[PDB]
Amino acid sequence: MREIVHIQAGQCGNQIGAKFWEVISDEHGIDPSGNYVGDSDLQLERISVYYNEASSHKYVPRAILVDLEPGTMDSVRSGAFGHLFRPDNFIFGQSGAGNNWAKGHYTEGAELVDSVLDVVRKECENCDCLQGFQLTHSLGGGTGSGMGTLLISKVREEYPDRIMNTFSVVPSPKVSDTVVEPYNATLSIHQLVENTDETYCIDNEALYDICFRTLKLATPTYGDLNHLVSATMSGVTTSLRFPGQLNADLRKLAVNMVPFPRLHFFMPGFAPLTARGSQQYRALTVPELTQQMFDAKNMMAACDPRHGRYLTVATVFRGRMSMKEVDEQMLAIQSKNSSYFVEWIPNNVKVAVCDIPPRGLKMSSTFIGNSTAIQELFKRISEQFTAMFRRKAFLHWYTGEGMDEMEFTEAESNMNDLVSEYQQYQDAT
Amino acid sequence: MREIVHIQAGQCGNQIGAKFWEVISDEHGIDPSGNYVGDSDLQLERISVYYNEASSHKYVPRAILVDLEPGTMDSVRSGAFGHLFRPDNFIFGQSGAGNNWAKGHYTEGAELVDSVLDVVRKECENCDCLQGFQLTHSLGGGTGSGMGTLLISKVREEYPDRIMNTFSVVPSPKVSDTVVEPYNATLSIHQLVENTDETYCIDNEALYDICFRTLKLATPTYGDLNHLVSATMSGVTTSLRFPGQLNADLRKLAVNMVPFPRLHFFMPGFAPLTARGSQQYRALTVPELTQQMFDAKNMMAACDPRHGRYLTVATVFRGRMSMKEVDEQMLAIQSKNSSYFVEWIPNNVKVAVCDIPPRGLKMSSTFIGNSTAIQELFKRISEQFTAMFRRKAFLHWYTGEGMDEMEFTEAESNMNDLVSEYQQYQDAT
Amino acid sequence: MRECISIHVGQAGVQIGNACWELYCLEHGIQPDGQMPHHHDSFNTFFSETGAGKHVPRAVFVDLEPTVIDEVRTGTYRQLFHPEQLITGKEDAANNYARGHYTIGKEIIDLVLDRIRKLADQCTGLQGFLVFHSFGGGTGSGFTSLLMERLSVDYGKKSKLEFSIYPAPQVSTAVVEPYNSILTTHTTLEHSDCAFMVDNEAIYDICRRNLDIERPTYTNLNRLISQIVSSITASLRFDGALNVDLTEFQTNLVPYPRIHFPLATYAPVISAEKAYHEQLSVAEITNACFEPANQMVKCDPRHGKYMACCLLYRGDVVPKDVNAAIATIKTKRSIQFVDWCPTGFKVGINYQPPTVVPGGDLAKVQRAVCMLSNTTAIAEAWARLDHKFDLMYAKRAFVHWYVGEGMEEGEFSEAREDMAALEKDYEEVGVDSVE
Amino acid sequence: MRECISIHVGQAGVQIGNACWELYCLEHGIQPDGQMPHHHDSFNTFFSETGAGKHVPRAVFVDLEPTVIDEVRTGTYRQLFHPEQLITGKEDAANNYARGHYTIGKEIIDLVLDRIRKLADQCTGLQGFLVFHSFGGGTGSGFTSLLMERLSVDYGKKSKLEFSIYPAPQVSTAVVEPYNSILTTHTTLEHSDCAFMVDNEAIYDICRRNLDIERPTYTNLNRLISQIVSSITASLRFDGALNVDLTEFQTNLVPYPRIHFPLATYAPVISAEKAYHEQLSVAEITNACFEPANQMVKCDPRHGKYMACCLLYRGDVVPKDVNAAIATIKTKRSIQFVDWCPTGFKVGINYQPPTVVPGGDLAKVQRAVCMLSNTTAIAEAWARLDHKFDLMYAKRAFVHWYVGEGMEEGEFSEAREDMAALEKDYEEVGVDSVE
Ligand SMILES: Nc1nc2c(ncn2[C@@H]2O[C@H](COP(=O)(O)OP(=O)(O)OP(=O)(O)O)[C@@H](O)[C@H]2O)c(=O)[nH]1
Ligand SMILES: Nc1nc2c(ncn2[C@@H]2O[C@H](COP(=O)(O)OP(=O)(O)OP(=O)(O)O)[C@@H](O)[C@H]2O)c(=O)[nH]1
């Protein structure tokens, strides 16, 4: 019940999804062939929320992998944990978006979106009581951004009741992996604030810094970062994929973390994060995790929370623990950081507790903070956009697909409206 | 309870600390891996005052090792009893203070002090009921002196209630291991008389003489001297790390030995000190230790007490003994040396008694004398300073970091004020 | 022959019920499968029986998220429950009162009422209802408001007892607790016969300080509340020197129709290692019950006035000692009843000692006393909620979920007005009379 | 049925209590775990009893440094004490009166008073209090002053006996003894019913000279003082030919409200090897008690006047011999009472012989006598303290700790004035009357 459907757009989306399904299968004890070899019945008590039991007692992910080029698709397909996806789900195009959002949302995407929606509809009808959708994508690449926004708009048209999650890799503040990413980012944010229930802003820069500083890895391959983000998502869903002393679902998180329709952007965080040697030299206590999850150096969004206020906060633990301990820790952390919280929201911490650790560990924790600091991000992007739009650089590439200047004008206006609202609620009284 | 945090600044500080933790672990029966293999429950009844119980039943020192160069840090880390420190505590810089105090307190130290304070704060929050801090450093080297003074000022800002101990290696009267040590010594003394609860003046010259004459060692390596000082510190803390017929703590010693805020400089001493062969040829009686601890040839500060008066005296014994014996010995020693004590402080001996010997022995003793003789030391230094400041030698090295002449003027004025006060109380009536 | 069904709504309700039915099965020597290897019938009031030696509870487990109910179905108490009693929804209200009262619960409420009516008609001397529900969760508040309205419509004058979980002043696991709490209180204020205030914060404090367990699990709090409820119904379920029914509870502890919010307290609560070194005097345990630190709601009773008290004793108890202890309590100054109620006590005595659950945390005691006390300090607690509500309403935060899920803003204004009126009535009672 | 609680403050108090309760358990044949395999009830006055054969002491162990209390919890007398009686602080006052009376003790005093009130209300014929505390230590002086003030506020007219440890004239383990002693005396002077002066220096001398133990441990002095206190309370705890209560002690030994500082003395004290070669005549042991070398305060009694004496005998004692010995004592010249008190004796006789602790140092004797004597020589001792205080105040030494920890200089001046006034009153009593 509460079946969840997974969508993966863009190269980053597909890679993250591959690592994610690896992690999920490892949690549920699922062989690479797709059949179960696990040991605990609770694995299969809710295997149906993410998997479908194909006949002859096999399991397939309920995912939909989308692309405009066969490269990364085939790369995943050849790799292990690839031969379990149902092959009909691999929808891909040939032209390639060329890292352009206009192609990914007007010209190229408009031709595959129909087949994608058909597969979506088939999967929806297969499910018993649909819970919602989770989209894994970037915001810079043309395919991910454009096609994901298109699919989100279409789905929200076809499902104004279900829940929607997006795991977008926001561009880093310092570096810029592409050149035209401000345009795609602005348009994608426009569509997201239009029709998304919640958005999980994530930066590669913060992941780099976490892997280097905290985990003491000077050689972080993209597999590691995707490994971390997938662990985060799995921790998000484990509250319903497994029993718990205080269970939660996606709907509860949306209710608790979104006081206003537009202000649904969240910075995540994970704990504990220990090196290979520096692990046994620390006590794995709930206060330790709690204090770990509250600092700049462990936020997966490159923005110091101290610059703003924590509008809302959610926290999902795992494994056996004592509830009173968690309550006391949350109380202390809310007391000591009094200046860092919204005044008119008392007791702004949502708590969920699971019974299963994510394997290997005794107790883990996931943090989902909706703060006012993230506005800086948008501010930054907005400024850049204006610059690149004042000289109308690269404007012809997007113009040639039917888009016009007024599109960018409206998107920038909308972004500045959102920034104004965020600042307004930051200094509310 | 009463958890104590250890700070080690400078090369001397780090070496002394390494020997110290070796001694402490030997007392508590702690394997080099950091796990307990001891035999007496009393070892672990108060293991928490100096150690933290990391998960999987291990123990880590509650120390913070600080430096501006990786050399001695790495040397210790490679050595045995190094693999038990929690690696995150090893804070070190790259520039190196260059044996300059200005670098160690204005330019170079100002960049690491923040991270050091962060680790300090984390450890403080880990502790249940903090007792106080002990700083292990020198006064000649730039790093030790400067950074220790900086940290002391910062901590006293953040903790105007806790207790503070400093184990400073004062420059020897005759030899001078460096050239510019008068400047660093003067500035360090300035900051110490500003914001230190108690300071344990120690000289390498006196340790040389004790090792040579008393212990009959013509080949004293620095390991031996560090072992002696570490034994002294361990004897200081054993009064609370173990039960006792008349227990004492750091706070009691501070109360008893510091009649006036500035006059908190103490010369320590230890007993018994016997050669390897000349040990069995002497009776280990409380009167013997008592008479041993009162003479010039067993003071760890190079100053004959007969030149001044014993303002106050503290004495901490160990092992099983008879209290009446100690009382009679203290009475006799105070009677026979009537000219050597302050008139207006009757019965100026504080006594503490432990139940555990420092291992290997039946009964030991530690002496902490606050006398007026030590003023000579300062006098000496002051004179030297004036000389080196009259010609303004080396003045440019300290000037180039922002320091000015008025700094030295004020520090020397303060030192002479302290000397005047010490002499005034010496000949009080 | 005096039956009383049990209703468990929401996750808190179901877990509390798990603990309570474990305790009951232990009380009457009943296996998890309904078999059994001073007692009267006794268990008939809460257990129905079939032809064989198999007994089933008179309980209803309703929830909108199948997780916890599935755990029950897989729990060691699997064979116990009649499978039809385990009503499971599909999507939980997700801490949203509107969903739990207008959208989702509205579509299974009829089946729930059907099972209720079946179990009622199968019984003969039905005393009343026992509702076990939290206050913040969407299912709890919403479904409970709906259920109370339906029951009051159907079963007009029968006992309806509630066990809410008052949200703690500082430990709030949810974020929208004030909204759901205000709505559910404004609704239930006109249907509930008698509530029973309990909070998790106070239970944490009690578990740490008295039982000397620093790190408690929800199971422990559930055990405590189960002990309380067992003490409440022991009079019905056992022979005592002075028995008492739920009708007597509602009559005695409710002076005014709106003010029916008594808080709970229990004693003795000491560790088994500390079981010795104290003889557990009846006056001693009475004083323990009256101590502000042993109460199960974070409200200083010295800030209010005990409008009514109900002390229920079980075990080796003798009436004269109870009388003496109560007189001594009345002598003390800091316990100032309302002037217009000079008789501030109803007493109940039972012969059956409380039973300690093996694998539990408490110690086998020969005597026990549960105090249900309706005081005036509770008013202050409402104020706190009031405050929070205003805040979350001064910025219209989170409103859109409730609006779009079948509710109007004027309803929120009306609920605030009703809570303010209740606080006003509490103050009005708090005053003293002239002449 | 005549209860009297025990209160142990500070390290000295706790160790003395260890010895005293060892002695009591030996007296009544009580195991360390409270079990037991002329006697009346007897032990009821100091032991309370639960349902089982387990008895607990009516004692309170309070300290600010958990070391010694933890040793007690680990001591062989672990099962004895009710765990709530072992109140432990976190940071000791560290020989600082200000900390022990304003900063630290102020924050556990309420819990201590709570436990005191619990134990008081559980008892019926409470005679009074027994305080065991040193004089120099910060916890002792500070917490004791606070406790006496609180008790006098709460329990107005009940017996309050104290056992201070008078700091020796020459053996001073601390350095700041005069400050704490002056402060605690200036405070307690208006609350304490009756103190009991004892010093370690005199006990050292007695142990060396009489018991012929050259190297004594604190355990030995504790055994001696425990024997004294057991002799003090044997009248309550046993049947005697002429019994006496603590009220009689305070009435007889306190002529003037301020002058209530009697010093202790005990006999016989001889080694077991020296147990023979002396028949221990009652007159002989009386003379032993009156010898200046057997007193437990380093003050030559021939320098003062015995304002009152109280001799308590236990064992095979016959009243006529006591009368004869007392008459002979009155005949002697060097014992010159005040002219205005011609009756300088109260006597107490008990049948229970003193019990020697196995593993002890004393010898089993058939008779024993404890003398509590209020004399005038004690005044001189105050002078010594006075002197020292002035010195440590003439230079304002050590003042900053006390100032910065919640005290003012005028308070020190006031304490000095009060001590001077007490010495003046002692001199005024020392004079003889005209007409
Ligand atoms: N005392 C106690 N309270 C519990 C326990 N388990 C859950 N709760 C309460 O349950 C609340 C969590 O929300 P719930 O009321 O359970 O919500 P729900 O019952 O799952 O219904 P929905 O809100 O629709 O999901 C917390 O505020 C707790 O107070 C328990 O074991 N003991
Ligand atoms: N007669 C006797 N006196 C003791 C014994 N143990 C400690 N003392 C007294 O205790 C004094 C030491 O200071 P304390 O009064 O114990 O201080 P404390 O009780 O630890 O309280 P703080 O000062 O706050 O640490 C000494 O002067 C001794 O006279 C004992 O075993 N027998």
Ligand SMILES: Nc1nc2c(ncn2[C@@H]2O[C@H](COP(=O)(O)OP(=O)(O)O)[C@@H](O)[C@H]2O)c(=O)[nH]1
């Ligand atoms: N965190 C993370 N980000 C990735 C990974 N691979 C690609 N990206 C991001 O994805 C963006 C490229 O988008 P892409 O999907 O390749 O282009 P598209 O085909 O137009 O959608 C870059 O900004 C990368 O930062 C990955 O493995 N991990």
Ligand SMILES: Nc1nc2c(ncn2[C@@H]2O[C@H](COP(=O)(O)OP(=O)(O)O)[C@@H](O)[C@H]2O)c(=O)[nH]1
């Ligand atoms: N007693 C003792 N003193 C030492 C030891 N090592 C270094 N020192 C002293 O430390 C001083 C050097 O300071 P150092 O820490 O090396 O320089 P810094 O890096 O600027 O702090 C010298 O005066 C030495 O006398 C040691 O092992 N024992």
Ligand SMILES: [Mg+2]
């Ligand atoms: Mg629910």
Ligand SMILES: [Mg+2]
């Ligand atoms: Mg003490």
